[PDB]
């Protein structure tokens, strides 16, 4: 490597074969003068942006253009120039042939010098005829002219045995030229006289010639293949301004152009491919006393030397040069620094390092000298010509035993950072919205408003609002009010009235939308309406009409819905009317409006109808009111929550209005709300720690962007300051994704590393004592261009995959299960050691795995030891220290690798841990915590051979039953306390994503949660208090717990997701269906007898002492009922409006519903086609289309659909049709379907210009899954539907 | 001109056992001036599409046909995890090896698409830049493919050449999951290399195979290892012997020839 | 583009732009066709015939 | 709410977060002088009916235009103006870099 600003590659490379010279013959001359399409004596140069030809490069002849441009009279356009030249050159040609007939002179040798002057004089209208007799060489191309007194001294004059020959223009500027950044550099070789050449047949003479001749300007020499014989070049005083902001002198220019030309050739050097000259660099022979150690003229000499000796520029050299580039290069050459190489300029001769690839010294007899004691420790290898890369690339730093002060790091960083700066925020959350709901269930335990969860009294504090706002802004989603409405609407339409066995919300009823909004979208009304009315919303049939009211209405009437107003009776009233409050003491007002709104709805809803009321802030007073003044006058109710943004907003639905009942708040409601509020609460505490939306990162925020940029970097040698910084950054972000870029900016080449800091990375950092330095190699090698990109906080846009989410879930638990000082033993740690960012920087650990880590060693503050070995092998644990053992996502594949059974490995693992000091053990295990169901595409289970298959990785892993695992532990540690960790509801783990700039997707999360049910964490406290499971831990059955070690005055609390399931202190106020608390004083054993209504994981806790101290016991699992199901069909089918009845044998715990998969999406089957009632019966109206559609029955009672049950009504598809009965027909889908009778096409459904057949009829209410498609009644016959 | 031919060989128990020390060594003159000339001229005068492609598609097709006795089925199943060690951006502007896309879309008969492909290497674009010769943060891959190059200027530097192969091999092992497989391209086959694989690797792999996509005259080779991390008793065979012998002879005879041709773009006097 | 027929009755056209998987059909996890790009399906009992276009 | 002819809404509302200030660096200056497509030191204003650009709003630099318009010699069409500006600004940029090389004054 690295000189000044210019960085050189770690390898050398040079050409090996030089071209054999060919003398110019008359024939050649004429051929050139002909200037035929393929072989013209010139080449056009284009502007790299516009692509217009802005200048021409001339060859031979044409190297004689040495007079004022005004004399030549060249046109300005290139294509015109070609003609102009072609013509004149022709004329000249014949002039030549007249004196030298081709018949006899075709093979004779022509005197290039003369040839050039000839054309050159003729093109400028100067006397040229006296030159012809010299066109053919007599004895010496030079000797011939040394005498002569012909032509102008403008072309050449003699000085005894020296011949002064004027250097002709090399490039001819065109008209379009403009010194544009993207115009090509012409190195002054496009002007009058830029140099004078002095030829002779021996250097000794040229040297002595300059004894008496000014050489202040600088004399250059080409010792390789002197373009026309031995000669020296004297620079003139003209200059190149094309490349700002520099002003280069011909001498410097010539040096520069050549120097670059070699640096280029050195890279495209191929052993079998010959080049014109081995060394293209001009070497400064005379006049160095006028150039100072700080002048460009000097440094160019160095660069020239390097290039000759084989060095290669670490930088990419374009095929076509441009001013901006040259400007940049020169800029580097002139920057601060020193000559790191061992080469220094010497007029004396050209130095060739002993171990240099070049071979000039062996191809020339004068000029070069190879110094035996001058060596460059460099490997020989050409360079990789890589194309430019459009966006930054990822980089994985590797470290080395070198250390540095932590301070120096942070300092270097702050000295190199691009911060502060405003980055694009990105999006926190993405994807469709999820819905949570609950409905009235008589069999649930009664609950009073006063027992329901209150709205947080801090919901209105400053930061709380901030949190909610940021979340809202960073959430990417379509029109909100739509998703919300369509959602509830679909839900409300599925509610069935027992006193009818049919839906409360029938199709074609009257509707009123309370609080309709015009919206800035320009729809002038809610987006739901139109789709709704046209029947584009599956499962929600269009109404008869919809009236709109509200302050912000457009297609309705403006009114204060909080008071009585002129309107009619509506069968369904929908109110998205908002409630506003500034402070907490104003909640009085909030609630008060809800009261008034409710009341207003009641009065507006007709008897037997239903209504929906959106509630912004749920408060007890509200729950109480509904309880006291409304539930008693409605058949049923339901609560919905379309989750879009974090808030408490709720949707209350009331069915069968104005009919005395005995409804009340239930347990389900209780649980529901509790979760509802908890969700919000936990997300808030998180979003509250993120940066402002469109903030300016100055590096204060715990979560932000880290980025540094180095100007004209330099690794190979004296770095440190650079190396330190880079290392420093890596410390700040550690394990985060890091991307680099190499590009030019304002004349300097730049290296930019970007990454993101999180609270986690800060943890790892604080665990450092010294700063580990990276191995620059990965970067040092880089020799290309990687365009940069604009910084974004939340980089990705798809949202973490289920797998990642899952991973995080585990990692979260680890970090929370470990406290300051605790010693850790992690088995199966990766090479990156993410653990380091999870456990406290005060807690020492030992990482064990077969594969060696990529982490540093002596740099840690507290013991951090890494071991290479199989943690499953025997004899090693003994010497190891440990308090908590962790083994996340390892044992499973570990086993699969050893061809063992999960039981096998687990057993082994336990046996190993047996002889440890450990008190607690956390193991991610492949074991089902509920009925077995495959999660298509992510997790597929084989009931038979105990195996889990993950299609996203193509792996196979074995698993075992809960019983076995527990058994294996109990036999090892009899007093161990086994607790299965509950996560399918807790969102606290999400902070390891959000706080780490990782976008989340609603869908992805749900999936991750399902997978957890089969890959839970088994936490074991070896010195705990055992419980004994006795009953049949399934929903609706009898279970029993035996708890020894306590007294009669001790109490137990059973929780269900932060929710209190029950407390032995009062079994009567339990949210569970049945609980019994008994104590056998003789044995000291308590016996709990229970029955559960909801499946899942429950945790036990005990309160000992009169002061009540909480001590945790384990947790148990309650599997769901049997997911078995069967459809029993009669012998004869009913194609009448009555429909046929089908017997369904399935457990009543599950709620059913039919769907259809249309174009890859689930559509809710038409509620008028299917009817479920009481045993279970399914009345279905047979449609001809059914033979072209497949419906499925799916469980709905959960936050997920068709998980436990997804049964395909296959017999419905294969029903056989009557050729003598009136049948029901509807199009299978939106396509054009050809209806055929006995092979005879009748009509085409869904075609433009469809005309209803005379003998057909229309069914009042359609049956097709899509309300937009009507159902017809066709006459007896053999029909067939064909799609087009 | 024309498509490229492929030469290969695989482990056969019924073959007579051979020791590394009995295998053919790389010519000690492989690095002499003219020898390089020959290899270069041949390379330049050879008309063919993107090389790295033909080579990859080739080995890939071959490696996919290997069957595991303990399964009666292929070691390389479809939809598995893949890692391409030493992926190159190339001047073509594809920003990655040309094999990948076709591979993933299932346009390559006999070679079913994987689940995913990660790219690493100094000259990468759609991957991560790292020194694959040392430990780095990554996962387990069912199939690792390494077109990572080894560079040497002189013959006395073959020490370095081989040394990297060692490190590369080792790195692959650690990166390949148990029961998986991997491929490692070897520029200059030397006894020390054969010995190493022999002593430290053959005993821990179910099977192996050697491939040679002939495009230019050189000694370059492709070593494939199947069923990794499972004790066995594999060894070098006779087939291997014969194979290499031919392999080196081929080169040798072509070289002595191409060595007598004119420079590429020479001037005939 | 291949025309799948059931008893002479055209059902669908394989490889056509705008192909829509028949309701009663199923997709085989790992294809069988010589070309991995082409998927394998599982059709219900019947007399099929394939006609190229 | 209601003052004179102007009617005010029944509610109040105000911003809560203020941006943290960032000092101007040489790099920034040059980058602005480059006037690249996304980050030009100006913004065009259109006539709400015709939609033609009728005026430009300047940012920094360019807040120094204080002499008679006749002195600047600006063209009249917006798209021509952009070119005119871009070119002159470029020239100046290099003039700056000549005295303050980016290699050493960038920050």
UniProtKB/Swiss-Prot annotation, chain B:
Q: How does it assemble?
A: Interacts with protein mu-NS; in viral inclusions.
Coiled coil region boundaries: none
Residues included from the entire protein: 431 to 699 of 1289
Q: What is this protein called?
A: Outer capsid protein lambda-2
Taxonomically, the superkingdom here is Viruses
Write out the function statement from the record: Outer capsid protein involved in mRNA capping. Catalyzes the last 3 enzymatic activities for formation of the 5' cap structure on the viral plus-strand transcripts, namely the RNA guanylyltransferase, RNA-7N- and RNA-2'O-methyltransferase activities.
- Similarity comment text for this entry: Belongs to the orthoreovirus lambda-2 protein family.
Task: Give the species this sequence originates from.
Answer: Reovirus type 3 (strain Dearing) (T3D)
Subcellular localization is given as: Virion
UniProtKB/Swiss-Prot annotation, chain D:
Q: Where in the cell is it found?
A: Virion
Domain of life of the organism encoding this protein: Viruses
Which protein family is it in? Belongs to the orthoreovirus lambda-2 protein family.
Query: What is the role of the protein in this entry?
Result: Outer capsid protein involved in mRNA capping. Catalyzes the last 3 enzymatic activities for formation of the 5' cap structure on the viral plus-strand transcripts, namely the RNA guanylyltransferase, RNA-7N- and RNA-2'O-methyltransferase activities.
**Subunit annotation:** Interacts with protein mu-NS; in viral inclusions.
What name goes with this protein?
A: Outer capsid protein lambda-2
Species, as recorded: Reovirus type 3 (strain Dearing) (T3D)
Q: What residues of the intact protein does this structure contain?
A: 2 to 108 of 1289
